[PDB]
Structures are given as structure tokens and as C-alpha cells.
Paper text:
WW domains organize molecular assemblies by binding to short, proline rich peptide motifs each with ~4–6 residues. In this study, we discovered that WW tandems, but not individual WW domains, can bind to target proteins with extremely high affinity and with very high sequence specificity.
We were able to obtain high diffraction quality crystals when the Dendrin PY23 sequence was fused to either the N- or C-termini of the YAP WW tandem. We solved the structures of these two versions of the complex. Thus, the two WW domains of YAP do not form a supramodule due to very limited inter-domain contact. Second, the Dendrin PY23 binds to the YAP WW tandem in a parallel orientation (i.e. PY2 binds to WW1 and PY3 binds to WW2), instead of the antiparallel binding orientation observed for the KIBRA/MAGI2 WW tandems. This is again likely attributed by the lack of inter-domain interactions between the two WW domains of YAP so that each domain can freely choose its more preferred PY-motif. In contrast, the coupling between WW1 and WW2 in YAP is minimal. Therefore, the target binding synergism between the two WW domains in the YAP tandem is also low. For example, the binding of YAP WW tandem to Dendrin PY23 is only a few tens tighter than the isolated WW domains, and this relatively low synergism likely originates from the very closely spaced PY-motifs of Dendrin PY23.
Author numbering: 134 to 188, 207 to 247
């Protein structure tokens, strides 16, 4: 299949189980792991990293929610994706 580019690697299909985050991470944030598997967070908005769950950035207050009908979830490998229940789709792109 070298004549075609590598296939798109999609998020988990809409139908099936999802490890949803009850409260989504704020837009522009990412979760990662250290080499020993310690969880930490990246704020791409102000280009910082921190141990503290956003749910040097001051995060007192509630952040922008997903639009109605959407949820944030995480793959087994820790990759965040977005579930749109309105049209039964999933996407790597944050709709906020």
C-alpha cells in the first residue's frame, strides 16, 4: 500500500465504549505522562506544564464547556478525542 499515503488513524468509533471525562479539560490543554508514567498537563495556550489538573496558569474558575451534545474522552493510550452525539461521530478536533 505504499502507493497510497498511510491511512488516517481515527479516534475510537462512535459506537462502542468510551472512557469519557466527566468534566472536559479546558480548550488547548493536553494530558501527558513522564517517562515513569507520572501524569501531568500541558497548557498550549500559555505554553506551560504542571502537575495540577486544570479542572503557572491560574485556573480558579469554570472553563468553556463543550457544545451541547458533545463529550470529551480519552483513548487507552491517553489521547484525548471528542464525541458528537448529535450526528454520532468522533473527532480528534476540539469543537470549542
Amino acid at each position: 500500500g505504499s502507493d497510497r499515503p498511510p491511512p488516517y488513524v481515527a479516534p475510537p468509533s462512535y459506537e462502542g465504549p468510551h472512557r469519557t471525562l466527566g468534566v472536559p479539560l479546558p480548550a488547548g490543554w493536553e494530558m501527558a505522562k513522564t517517562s515513569s508514567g507520572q501524569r501531568y498537563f500541558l497548557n498550549h495556550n500559555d505554553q506551560t506544564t504542571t502537575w495540577q489538573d486544570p479542572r503557572q496558569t491560574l485556573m480558579n474558575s469554570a472553563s468553556g464547556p463543550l457544545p451541547d451534545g458533545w463529550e470529551q474522552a480519552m483513548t487507552q493510550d491517553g489521547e484525548v478525542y471528542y464525541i458528537n452525539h448529535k450526528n454520532k461521530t468522533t473527532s480528534w478536533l476540539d469543537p470549542r
